[PDB]
From Swiss-Prot, chain A:
GO biological process annotation, one example: mitochondrial electron transport, cytochrome c to oxygen
Binding-site positions, heme c: 14, 17-18, 80
Localization terms from the record: Mitochondrion intermembrane space
Domain of life according to the entry: Eukaryota
InterPro entries assigned to the protein according to its UniProt record, in alphabetical order: Cyt_c-like_dom, Cyt_c-like_dom_sf, Cyt_c_1A/1B
Residues the record lists as N6,N6,N6-trimethyllysine modifications: 72-73
PTM info: Methylation may enhance its transport into mitochondria. Methylation occurs in fungi, plants, and some protozoa, but not in animals. The precise role of methylation at Lys-73 is unknown, but it seems to preclude pro-apoptotic activity, possibly by lowering affinity for APAF1.
Protein name per the record: Cytochrome c isoform 1
UniProtKB/Swiss-Prot annotation, chain B:
GO cellular component: a single term: mitochondrion
Substrates-to-products reaction catalysed: 2 Fe(II)-[cytochrome c] + H2O2 + 2 H(+) = 2 Fe(III)-[cytochrome c] + 2 H2O
GO MF terms held by the record: cytochrome-c peroxidase activity; heme binding; metal ion binding; peroxidase activity
Keyword line: Heme, Hydrogen peroxide, Iron, Metal-binding, Mitochondrion, Organic radical, Oxidoreductase, Peroxidase, Phosphoprotein, Transit peptide
Gene behind the chain: CCP1
UniProt site positions, description: Transition state stabilizer: 48
Positions spanned in the full protein: 68 to 361 of 361
Name this polypeptide is given: Cytochrome c peroxidase, mitochondrial
Residues engaged in binding heme b: 175
Subunit structure: Forms a one-to-one complex with cytochrome c.
Active site, UniProt feature: 52, 191
Superkingdom, natural source: Eukaryota
Post-translational modification note: CCP1 precursor is processed by the rhomboid protease PCP1, which cleaves the N-terminal hydrophobic transit peptide. The m-AAA protease (composed of YTA12/RCA1 and YTA10/AFG3) is required for CCP1 maturation: m-AAA protease promotes membrane dislocation of the CCP1 transmembrane segment within the transit peptide to ensure the correct positioning of CCP1 within the membrane bilayer, allowing intramembrane cleavage by PCP1.
Amino acid sequence: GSAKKGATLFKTRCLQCHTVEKGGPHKVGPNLHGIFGRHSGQAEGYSYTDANIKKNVLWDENNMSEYLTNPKKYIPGTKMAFGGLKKEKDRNDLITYLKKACE
Amino acid sequence: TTPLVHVASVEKGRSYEDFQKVYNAIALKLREDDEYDNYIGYGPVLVRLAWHISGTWDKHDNTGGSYGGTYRFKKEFNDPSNAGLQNGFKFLEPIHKEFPWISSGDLFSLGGVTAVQEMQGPKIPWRCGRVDTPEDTTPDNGRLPDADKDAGYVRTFFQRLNMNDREVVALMGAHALGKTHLKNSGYEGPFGAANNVFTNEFYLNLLNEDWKLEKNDANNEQWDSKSGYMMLPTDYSLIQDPKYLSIVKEYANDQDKFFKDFSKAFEKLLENGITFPKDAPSPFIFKTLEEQGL
Ligand code: HEM
Ligand code: HEM
């Protein structure tokens, strides 16, 4: 996917609630540094819903695609108010960008 | 001559299934055209369009309102209060050509309802039957409210639409959605965090963020949070007035309640000025794309 297009999708659709850089501030949602290959509901300092912790999934590219398609469908009771990326292209691009952005 | 009366009149041989298909077209266009306004989507502007075509109503002589579809004429179109709504109008254009039988008022109001529903808001019952009226029935400019005002102004203004305190607080919750644009209204910025998902975040934000009253690039004063949001003076006055403040805390503690009251208020809004006869169908609750499997 296009990491640059992914960067635009993140800036316009995620950034208001998430930062990506290491030791980045918690905002509406948790900081996403180190997100891939970590268990959900595990950001230090952040207060998750029990649903997010209970989901208990190591985040990877596929489950990320699924979540971001429809976050309430993948984790019922989640407080992330987000419609969903409904175009597979945009999911691939976003995840491409997020892969490197938050390493 | 008698007070002006507007009798709902169902489009000849149309029924719930037809309106569901109009809804579907609106919702599908909403889902697919996701780039607009830096990926906010058309949802918020459709909601604003439905409120604006409705908010011209004057309960004292039944002059304004959604019935007449009068937004389609230049005098109402170029109303400075309405700058930016041309986008919602142009959005709804191809849909009107696909269902040329639907009256303009029915289409605008339906746009707003569809938007609120697709954005994961409450279900809003909707009634058809608005009828296009002549160009001389179009309300004068200046019937919509100003932003640089206080709570007293707000309460007073809403009397004209027959809305009480709870209905006003509920309706204002729609400022969870979308943003102000400088070139439209002299105000700039996102109202909140979830720009296109219908939540009770308006209330929560009003109460929980740290706001400062400052001048923007148009020299207008608006309340900005450190978290990057903005509120108009009319919005913030909902925490400056004690009675409003109660209701604000209520909706902030209970989203479900807010959804209920908002659905009631919004439908009332879209229907003010309309008389529905006895033979009229019951109000329609339309199926979202989501519960159709999309
Ligand atoms: C495509 C856009 C977005 C992406 C990729 C994204 C990323 C993520 C990820 C990976 C998680 C799980 C974090 C974890 O389990 O540690 C999460 C949760 C969360 N996000 Fe988002 N985010 C997006 C948009 C948003 C928006 C728009 C909001 C708020 C308006 C938001 C607020 C939250 C919140 C509050 C949670 C925690 C949910 C809970 O604890 O139940 N995010 N996000
Ligand atoms: C005292 C009452 C109100 C005032 C002063 C007011 C004023 C405004 C202003 C100035 C804007 C900026 C328009 C722009 O720059 O694009 C706006 C946006 C908006 N308004 Fe209100 N409004 C009021 C009530 C309402 C109500 C009752 C609703 C819905 C039921 C509503 C829905 C919206 C929505 C959804 C937007 C965002 C539109 C977009 O993002 O394109 N407003 N409002």
